[PDB]
Amino acid sequence: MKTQVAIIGAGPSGLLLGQLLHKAGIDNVILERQTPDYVLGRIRAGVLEQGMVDLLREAGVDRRMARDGLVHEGVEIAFAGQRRRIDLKRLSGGKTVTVYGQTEVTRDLMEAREACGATTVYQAAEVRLHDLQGERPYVTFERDGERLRLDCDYIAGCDGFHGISRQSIPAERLKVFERVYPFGWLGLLADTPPVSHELIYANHPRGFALCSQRSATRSRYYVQVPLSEKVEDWSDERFWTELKARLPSEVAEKLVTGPSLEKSIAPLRSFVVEPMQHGRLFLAGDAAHIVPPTGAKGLNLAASDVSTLYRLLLKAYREGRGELLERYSAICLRRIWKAERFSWWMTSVLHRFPDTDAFSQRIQQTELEYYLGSEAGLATIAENYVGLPYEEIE
Numbered sequence: 288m289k290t291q292v293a294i295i296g297a298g299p300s301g302l303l304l305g306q307l308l309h310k311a312g313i314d315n316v317i318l319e320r321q322t323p324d325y326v327l328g329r330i331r332a333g334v335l336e337q338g339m340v341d342l343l344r345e346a347g348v349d350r351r352m353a354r355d356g357l358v359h360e361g362v363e364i365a366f367a368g369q370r371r372r373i374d375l376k377r378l379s380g381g382k383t384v385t386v387y388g389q390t391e392v393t394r395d396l397m398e399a400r401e402a403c404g405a406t407t408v409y410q411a412a413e414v415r416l417h418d419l420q421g422e423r424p425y426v427t428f429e430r431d432g433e434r435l436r437l438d439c440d441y442i443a444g445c446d447g448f449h450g451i452s453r454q455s456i457p458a459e460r461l462k463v464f465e466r467v468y469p470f471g472w473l474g475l476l477a478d479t480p481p482v483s484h485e486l487i488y489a490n491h492p493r494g495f496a497l498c499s500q501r502s503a504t505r506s507r508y509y510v511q512v513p514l515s516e517k518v519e520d521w522s523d524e525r526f527w528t529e530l531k532a533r534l535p536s537e538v539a540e541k542l543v544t545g546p547s548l549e550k551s552i553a554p555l556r557s558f559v560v561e562p563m564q565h566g567r568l569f570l571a572g573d574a575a576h577i578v579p580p581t582g583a584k585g586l587n588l589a590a591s592d593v594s595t596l597y598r599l600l601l602k603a604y605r606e607g608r609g610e611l612l613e614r615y616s617a618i619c620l621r622r623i624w625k626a627e628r629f630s631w632w633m634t635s636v637l638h639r640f641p642d643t644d645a646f647s648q649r650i651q652q653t654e655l656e657y658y659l660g661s662e663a664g665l666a667t668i669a670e671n672y673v674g675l676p677y678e679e680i681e
């Protein structure tokens with residue numbers, strides 16, 4: 288096979304980049320290890336930044352989101368028997384976020400790509416990268432038995448945290464920055480109306496809790512749990528009972544519960560590699576960095592990496608300015624770190640950490656009181672939540 292840009296991974300990152308590149312006349316082939324249905328089984332993200340929303344419209348894949356998505360102008364934080372609303376629209380200068388499931392986004396992109404006739408190879412096993420330092424790199428893989436080769440000009444590693452792309456770069460050329468948190472998020476998707484029209488992040492003595500949604504009739508709740516917990520030990524009943532216990536009584540009382548459509552435990556981690564490229568290989572999304580879900584930045588950083596890489600690839604193909612691709616990592620890393628810092632802060636002030644001394648506890652409580660009780664404080668939260676502006680490039 289032969290293409291211009293080879294893309295590893297049919298997740299949100301690969302699909303969005305592929306779609307974007309396709310519409311601009313740049314040939315691209317996506318290689319996915321799993322099956323279409325397997326990819327669609329992942330719930331994940333719910334909050335999208337305006338930047339991601341715009342990138343979707345630019346990909347021509349926004350019909351459904353426009354119709355089914357919900358724009359939120361604020362979020363609530365509950366702590367120490369208080370409930371503080373963060374007016375995102377007002378504090379950020381008019382910016383908002385949109386609630387639209389990652390599953391739907393992925394689905395919208397997949398159907399759109401199939402309709403356009405772009406190349407996507409699912410169940411592509413043993414993906415291996417080759418000749419990344421040359422001008423003619425290629426990818427090898429196995430499909431239903433035989434080994435195939437895909438020649439290209441550039442490879443976009445969009446294969447997630449455990450993708451092969453980041454492992455295809457000489458370790459000594461990369462610097463890893465990482466932190467694993469002493470707890471995970473037990474999530475529960477239920478076909479019930481959300482308890483609130485806006486998200487509710489709750490710091491409670493018993494632990495973190497979050498009330499989110501996917502639509503007017505679909506909810507997504509999370510509760511903090513230690514690493515030792517196994518999802519099989521948490522029945523829907525146990526979840527609802529614990530969730531209720533971590534929420535203000537006036538909220539737990541009217542909460543509509545129901546059987547889970549999906550339950551699982553996701554560990555929290557911050558991760559960043561520098562640089563994010565190597566020769567003809569560029570890493571995007573989870574392949575290059577991870578953030579705890581607390582700040583709703585994971586998918587949105589994948590979006591900004593993709594926007595940056597796409598625009599640089601345009602410059603390269605349309606304008607023969609391939610040397611600009613050298614600025615990919617630098618550009619992306621600046622937005623990444625600021626998003627990592629916010630995600631870390633959110634995680635830091637909303638979760639209960641084991642072995643917390645009296646001082647740390649008081650500081651965490653005061654962080655909320657100050658940031659939630661100051662116009663300037665609220666502003667640092669809002670502007671970061673809606674997401675910082677994309678860097679123009681060039």
Ligand SMILES: Cc1cc2nc3c(=O)[nH]c(=O)nc-3n(C[C@H](O)[C@H](O)[C@H](O)COP(=O)(O)OP(=O)(O)OC[C@H]3O[C@@H](n4cnc5c(N)ncnc54)[C@H](O)[C@@H]3O)c2cc1N(C)C
Nearest residue numbers: 296298299300320332333334446447572573583585586587
């Ligand atoms: C609880 C949760 C909430 C989240 N909430 C939000 C949120 O509201 N807002 C937000 O911005 N982000 C959130 N996240 C994070 C977000 O979901 C992630 O950052 C996002 O999924 C990243 O997207 P991508 O970079 O595209 O990465 P993905 O992991 O989604 O997709 C990568 C694809 O690569 C494939 N693959 C892997 N190895 C391969 C190989 N060697 N060869 C070929 N294919 C391979 C995989 O099968 C897969 O299909 C969340 C993630 C969570 N979980 C479970 C991880």
